[PDB]
Amino acid sequence: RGSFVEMVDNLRGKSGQGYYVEMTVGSPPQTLNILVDTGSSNFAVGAAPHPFLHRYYQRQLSSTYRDLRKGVYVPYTQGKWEGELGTDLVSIPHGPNVTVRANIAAITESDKFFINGSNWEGILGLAYAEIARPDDSLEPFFDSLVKQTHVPNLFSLQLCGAGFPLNQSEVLASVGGSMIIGGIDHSLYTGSLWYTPIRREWYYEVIIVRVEINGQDLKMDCKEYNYDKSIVDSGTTNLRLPKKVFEAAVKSIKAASSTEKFPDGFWLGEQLVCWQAGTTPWNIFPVISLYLMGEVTNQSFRITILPQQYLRPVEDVATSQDDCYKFAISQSSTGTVMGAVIMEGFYVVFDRARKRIGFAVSACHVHDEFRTAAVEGPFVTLDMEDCGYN
């Protein structure tokens, strides 16, 4: 049901630029749009004028600001920033009714971090201390939140991809999803919730034990699927796979859709392809199933996405009436990354309390009249622990 109404629909944005929630820092409260990123553990915000920022954190205006006299540097797969550490009172307008003092990195320098038009000025690293900068002694935001309040050690995300391009004004006007803090709202999904164990508390790491393209087993040593790790990251657009897995999957995805030929630039995620209005040939593209280690011994389940998920909508160059997309699956040299496009198909529950991650068909996932995303199980699978890379 509508368990947490005050938090439903509190996100905005899209896979390409990121999903963000509204937050306030300081006294008096300073409103800022914060990118929700489960792929990192640092809470940082722009603290100085930037051509891509309409606003930013102003420490000298916060009576509750506290200087920690320490610098911090944080590099991501793509983009990085430098800033000064401190703490302050923080709140989430559309979230639990509480205020907590959290560590905040005031970004003073950055390169390829902020996105023009994204509308967010900071980032919320929801992962664990293990990968926090400068070190694990810097308590991550969610941790501070649980220690200081009675909010359950859990949060769930519902990222809603529109299924078509969204221009600046409409991205700002539309609801991009919900981030339920401290609970699970049943109106955000259908079917049952299946859980996969969080292998280790640093990134939100899971283990993929099998991969299928339209039912066909990619048939690779499952260790490849998790080389050198597999994480869930709302801050990554595409579904990224380690080189060898990417090469096999693309070869299989190309064979399944062979009735049409596409340029290499398309499969490299660099160039888009367009089709006459409403004629995208979805049925020629295969569904992709990722089996994940289950909670019960030798048991697994699978999540299945449609091309409506891995083909990312983008406005045509000549702003035509054509429906154009980009291949939202790309190579990776740092393991698998189940990004926004994968998440847009499901309601993902980060059960930190029970050290597990649950998936369920999203009530807002894009599909057609012939297929829908899915989460099914159980499946008898042996030696899944071995699928994990060491």
Partner: peptide, 7 residues
Amino acid sequence: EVNXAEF
């Protein structure tokens, strides 16, 4: 696109 941490 966004590709958010290196460890």
